[PDB]
RNA sequence: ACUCUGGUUUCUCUUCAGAUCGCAUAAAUCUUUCGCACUAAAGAUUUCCGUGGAGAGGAACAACUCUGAGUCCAAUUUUUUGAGGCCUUGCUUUGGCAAGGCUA
């Protein structure tokens, strides 16, 4: 729903945010190895 | 001994940090090692608990402590005198200079 929908999108930015901080540097390692 | 900065606290955001970033110490995954892997070791990666530095924004009271900066000597030894006057020579830039001999 409406509600659900900005929720889960909430949710979901405040996950990213979370693994933001080491975000570059496990990401570069990810796709090195 | 006179004047001008810088404050401290609190909330949020951004970046860097292999520094006991933490006077503490978890978990997962992969690889290797031997056992035969909670009762086991090594290497690497990741995630978590949560930090310091710098920068930026917000808002609460202290504003010159501190950090800075701009702002009494006459008697030997130094700054309260042994100073000035005469003579010769080289050159006179004819003002006298240089050296020596003097008198005080």
């Known amino acids: ?5 900005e929720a889960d ?4 930015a ?3 945010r979370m693994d933001e901080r ?4 496990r990401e570069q390692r990810e796709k090195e190895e």
């Open 22 to 25: 080491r975000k570059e540097r």
């Open 9 to 12: 999108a909430i949710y979901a």
């Open 14 to 16: 405040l996950d990213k």
């Open 1 to 5: 729903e409406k509600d659900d929908e």
